[PDB]
Amino acid sequence: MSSLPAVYIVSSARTPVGSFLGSLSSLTAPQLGAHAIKAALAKVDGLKPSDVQEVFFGNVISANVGQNPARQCALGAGLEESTICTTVNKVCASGLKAIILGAQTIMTGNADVVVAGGTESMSNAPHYLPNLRTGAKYGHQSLVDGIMKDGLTDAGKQELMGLQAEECAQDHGFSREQQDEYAIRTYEKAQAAQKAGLFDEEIAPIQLPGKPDVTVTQDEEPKNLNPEKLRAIKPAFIPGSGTVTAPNSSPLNDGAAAVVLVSEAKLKELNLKPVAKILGWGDAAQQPSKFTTAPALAIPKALKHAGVGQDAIDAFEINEAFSVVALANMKLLGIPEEKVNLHGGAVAIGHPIGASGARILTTLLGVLKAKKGKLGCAGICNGGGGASALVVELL
Template sequence: MATNDAMIVAGVRTAMGAFMGGLASVPAPQLAAACVKGLVARTRVPADQINELFMGNCIAAGLGMNPARQAAIFGGLPPSVGATTLNKACASGMKAVMLADQAVRLGDAELVIAGGMENMSRPPYLLLKGREGYRMGNSEVYDALIYDGLTDAFHNKHMGVFADRCAQKYGFTKQQQDDFGVRSHTRARQAIESGVSADEIVPVEITVRGKTTSFATDEGPLKFDEAKMRTLKPAFGPEGTVTAGNASSINDGAAALLVASNAACQRLGLKPQARIVGGAVYSREPEWFTLAPIGAMQKLMEKIGWNVKDVDLFEVNEAFATVALAVEKELGLPPEKVNIYGGAVALGHPVGCSGARILVTLLNGLKRTGGRRGVGTLCVGGGEGIAMAVELVS
């Protein structure tokens, strides 16, 4: 390890709430605050030693000023800890960790909390012409969830339209995509039932029928009905193959990681889990965002000198089954090494959270399987892909 390496001390996440499910009433900054509290408790890091917090968030309408700052204060960090909210669509959470990595490597910070947050059950509806006035006639109400989170800004089409194009390019059938969805759900359910996923999760207090309870179990995989999923119709056109069952679900959740310098770890007695080996972003035509993770992973591997055989586990965000299938096909990834605890088709894809969530899950998987090297990647709305590599330390 180099003296300026950035280390991941620990990572946590909330359980993933279903759309309008158990976490629907909890604003995204409060979900992130639960992760901040949990992270500080697990690592026993003095809160006043943390230099900054970076938190990704995609759909910020109605959240109030600087959601990351809210997460920091509500999470128990002192007012002296600065906070920055960033939006890089699906990459928001992972980009936050990249910024933490850079801050530590450059010596600008020694201890940074980084992650992502999203509550897709809560975005408001928008009156885009309300400021100037309507004068007369009908107008349109926009759903911020769809407008800011799920629509390509360059073609004004739902992201799923381009997922269908990806499936068509590779000849992926609906059955192949459904089979992938079953794989994701099966692995996620097994992780829940065996207690594996519980290691990642910090509880969120919610109120149900006037009583306070803890929300600590991913909702989606436990409701899965394979027979029903296989009967779902194409969601983005009659000739398509992408359905609500083989695409990621709409969900609520947050995740956070503590990134530290070697010096801070030694000074405070922190035991790092892994070092951040590197990260990469790859950009191309917006309509082919589905294939951008391939370029991001190739760019990353070249940068750090790894190849596929050097990597023990992969986390490929399952925005759509066809994205993960394309990444596996193009890069020759062994399916048994990809998303071993299920992915976004089963757990869901809270957009601003997922980039951090897959890193938390990746670390858990490496630790449990005895692996050492891991890579996580996501497709990103707007035509980008992002990837990060980590390596466990003894």
């Protein structure tokens, strides 16, 4: 990092995270993303929506969303038609890479005010008919599930992410029981944070037109913890000897999250109060079926970029694609669980894939405040072999 123009986070906001075909399933991904952008900008005293110059928004399963999901998010949030808008896809890391690109655009001097984040409506992912143009003369055909194909299946092995999670349990020696106790713990932390009001600030509730109106205030998944059923359920990907289950994996989910970034000159020009400063970031990648432990490369790289030692981080967000992913990255990096996902993680909160990268950053800012920490680091792995990480200082 060192001597480049500083980048400040002046706000952040997220939708509640809805369950698959659940509370938010009637909204499109641009609708969720617009809602988060609008709510992030409303929090900045002295910054107008018309000051936003550029948007990078993550989104993975973009089929049937329409032209440029980010542009639709931005216009739907009331930004000016002059706003530059780009949609980003690095699968599960899309939301964080979007924020990195936003910070880079300020650093290279091409913008002073950037909104970045991500959105996903997994409920509204369609099915594909791939061969209607040239036809298929004879034989049964397939309707491809867009979630499986473009979100959850490794391209080279043609295996779903749960089988990569099983590789992870084998590679790093985590049993069914260890994965279940981790998942119970992270559900408990998410429920405790919920009940204590600790998500109230970051969440922007959604009002659904009515019957009268419906208001969605809370993330849908945390309440679902039942530890007896969790410990008793059959494994989801390998019969008999499997370790990965639907309880101890992240679910399929709907949601969006956004941050507002400004340059140092704009912070002073508009007399803005920054929430946090971006200190650095890192992307890394390894063998695609081992994407589960790519954060163990991206996190040290972000820390080096930021000029910060790992021990000085007060809180980590390690995205819980599966419970085994958190366990393996904690083991490889030597990070105690006492510093990880202090308000729960994606296993209990949900995982709307194009949004999760920005979602955990929003939650991390809340964790640092609630726990009186200064330095935080978010790390998220992604299908294909990659991971992205970011370091922030709460001001």
